[PDB]
Structure formats: C-alpha cells, structure tokens
C-alpha cells in the first residue's frame, strides 16, 4: 500500500502515459483508503472523474462504431456477419457495465458518504447520474427504463441541492444542467424539456456573470458555450412534443 | 472456434473499433489454425502485422513518456518519486516483453515454417528482427546484448535472402534495409554503418526506379523518402529525434 500523496503521483503518471485503466486503479485505491472518513481534495476529485471519463469514453466510442456496423450489416441481410457483430457488441457492453458498476459502487459506498458540503454532493450525485445515463445508452427496455429512472433520481437530487446552495455560475452546477438536459434530449426524447432546462441554467449564469472569478471562468464559460451549442443544435432540429455535447 | 474467413472479419471488426489487443487474438488464432500446413494470404499477413504494430506502438510510446519522466525526477534528486517511476516503467517493460514474445513465438513456431517463398520469408524474418529490436530498446546490460544479437541474426538472414531473390525496389526489401539501418544507429550507435546501409539501398533502388511503374512507385518511393529522412536526421545529428522505421 502506498500513501495518499503517492497515489496522486501514480495517477498523474498513468495519465501522462495514457494508461487510464491503471489511472482508475490508482485513484480507487486512494478513495477506498481515505474515504468516507475524510473528503477528497478538488485535485483528487477531478483525477478520479478524468480517469473514469477516459476509460468509459473509449468504450462508448467503440460501442458507437460497433453498433453502427451492426446496422450496416443488418441492412445487407448478411445474417452471418450480424451474428458475429452482435457477439462483439455484447462484449463491449459487458465492459461498459463493468466500468459503470465500478464507479457507481464507489459513489454509494465511499464518495457520497464523504461529501460534507453541497458542492461535493452535487458533484458525486451528478457523477452518479452520468454513469447511470451511460448505462441507459446501450440498454434496451426495462433495463433502460430502470437506468433512466436511476438517472432521473441522481440528477434531480443534485439539481435540488445545487439550486439552493450552489451559484448558477459554478461549473459543477452548470455541468449538472448540461448533462441533465442531454439526458432528457437523448434518453427521454424530450427536446422541449431539455431546451427549457439548458436555457434556464444559461440565463441564470449570465445574470450573475459579473461575480465570476479567475479560478472557474473558463470552466464555466466553456460549459455555457456547450449549453448554447446544444441548444442551437436542438432548436435547429425540430422535435414533436415532449450526438449532443456533455460536460467536460 | 471460428473459421479462417470469420477470424478475418473479427480482426477487421476489432480494427475499426480500435480494440487492437483483441485484433491480435483474432489473428493469433487464425495463424495457429491455418499454418504451417498452408501460408497466410497477403491480407491475413498484413492484418497480423498491423495488429501487433499498434499494440507494441502504444506501449513503446508510453515507455518513452515514462522513461522521460524518470530522467527528470532523477535530475531533481527526488529519490522517492524516482523509485516510484521505475516500478511503473518496469511494469510497462514487462508488458512490452509479453507482446514481443507473443509474436516472436508465433514467428518461430508457425509463420516462418509456413513461408514457402522468399518474399514471405523476408517479410517474416524482417518482422522477427523488428520485435527483437523493440526488446533491445528498453533492455539493458546482459539482456540487451542478447536482444541485439538476436536482432542481427534475423535481419542478416532476411538481407541474405532479400539481396538474392528480391528486387532492390521492393518495399519489403527497402523496409528491411530501413529498419536494419535504424538498428545500427539506435541500438549499436554505428552512425557510419547505418548511413552506408541506408544510402546503398536508396542507390540500388533509384538505379532500378525508372523501370518501376506507378503501381508501386508510391510504395518504393515512400520508404525511399524515409531512408533519406533518417539520413538527413543522422547527418544533422553528427553536427554536435527517433528514426523513421518502416510502415
């Protein structure tokens, strides 16, 4: 076993080598060894989030490609290749599930219990909704509806806490509104609800934009632009009743 | 167990998804089931080469980064951080060793025996030397010399066959001379021999490049352009980067 400061060094070392599967292991060991008794630092909090974002991001990108090839093979009526491709996609899906379960388990057992402030709660609850949403991207029915309900619970909990204590210009609250609006748009097909949410968070940040500090102005404004980009792509598109840019 | 044609489809599928560790496995099983009784098709032979190239390239890239991190830490005399980085580098080295052994074992047990033509023999022998050279990159001391010796034998064997049966404009023979010259410059620090070897291959090829058509002109000239890129880098290096190996 290494020290807390040493796992941060090993996580960064793995980050430089783009060996993210091991960056996750180094941060998990840091988490399980310092929480829930104590709270993660902003640095450790972001290193963990970055580690899982890259690991799952790589599998999400692969799943898109495989799923796309499957549709291309089913349009050819190539029954042979369709059988092989679906075997492969399920292998990627089991790995997507493995990673989401890892962080979701760490969120319930360690991270959320460790949050002793609204900022940390909203961060981990948002994160909890994020990886439930990733589960909902490849699940079919029932499993997807369950994945969607778990997403709704985690996000709406983070939204309640954030709106009451977080500032509308805080990147975490902004990122929450972004990913939450992506949830309505891409998981629930509610363009109207998703646009109304993104716009509200955007305008709320504009009103208090003067009181935005050096530390988080780029993080905030970046999310603000992603909200505006999505809102343009969504309003440019046209739904009927009821990829998008998620947070950094 | 799947069929030969299907392993090709799965290897191609893994390549599209950029899941190269699996692309290797699909081809490994294709090889162990089809050879040495028969020989790999050019397609299969290339799918195998690409799969291992990406896997070992990814680790070689990480090893350069980690190895670079270690040096800086030592320059500051952190001591603690230094011991941590080496333990991490040694983990990447064990993986590099695992990959190379995988293809090297596949070469000596299945692929080289299957080669019933000089072109294939030189392709598989040139590959054997490539992955012994990758061992020599991170090995040190006693283990390094053994790796450098194994590289010399694979390349020299491929060169003997190539110079006798392959044309000096053939991309495989040009790539061999390219990687074989990089071996002398990077591993053995023989700046002169690496240059003499590169120039010879580039001279022997241009002397026959006129009679070469536009079908493989891009193939030959591309490796030729790499032979001179290294040869320009090396000359400037003697005016006191990583050499361009073959595609």
Author numbering:
A (entry chain A): 4 to 245, 1170 to 1175
B (entry chain B): 4 to 243, 1169 to 1175
Tell me, in the authors' exact words, what the paper reports.
Brassinosteroids (BRs) are vital plant steroid hormones sensed at the cell surface by a membrane signaling complex comprising the receptor kinase BRI1 and a SERK family co-receptor kinase. Many phosphoproteins of the BR signaling pathway, including BRI1, SERKs, BKI1 and BZR1/BES1 can associate with 14-3-3 proteins. In this study, we use quantitative ligand binding assays to define the minimal 14-3-3 binding sites in the N-terminal lobe of the BRI1 kinase domain, in BKI1, and in BZR1 from Arabidopsis thaliana. 14-3-3λ and 14-3-3 ω isoform complex crystal structures reveal that BKI1 and BZR1 bind as canonical type II 14-3-3 linear motifs.
Both 14-3-3λ and 14-3-3 ω form the canonical 14-3-3 homodimer in the different crystal forms. Dimers within the same asymmetric unit are highly similar, but the ω isoform dimer adopts a more closed conformation when compared to 14-3-3λ, even when bound to the same peptide ligand. Asn233 forms hydrogen bonds with the backbone of both peptides. Mutation of Asn233 to Ala in 14-3-3λ had little effect on pBKI1267−272 binding in ITC assays, but reduced pBZR1169−175 and pBRI1869−874 interaction by ∼5-fold and ∼2-fold, respectively (compare Figs. 1, 2). The mutant protein had no tendency to aggregate and behaved as a stable homodimer in solution, suggesting that the mutations do not interfere with protein folding or homodimer formation. Together, our mutational analysis of 14-3-3λ highlights specific binding of the pBRI1869−874, pBKI1267−272 and pBZR1169−175 linear motifs to 14-3-3s from Arabidopsis and validates our pBKI1 and pBZR1 crystal complex structures.
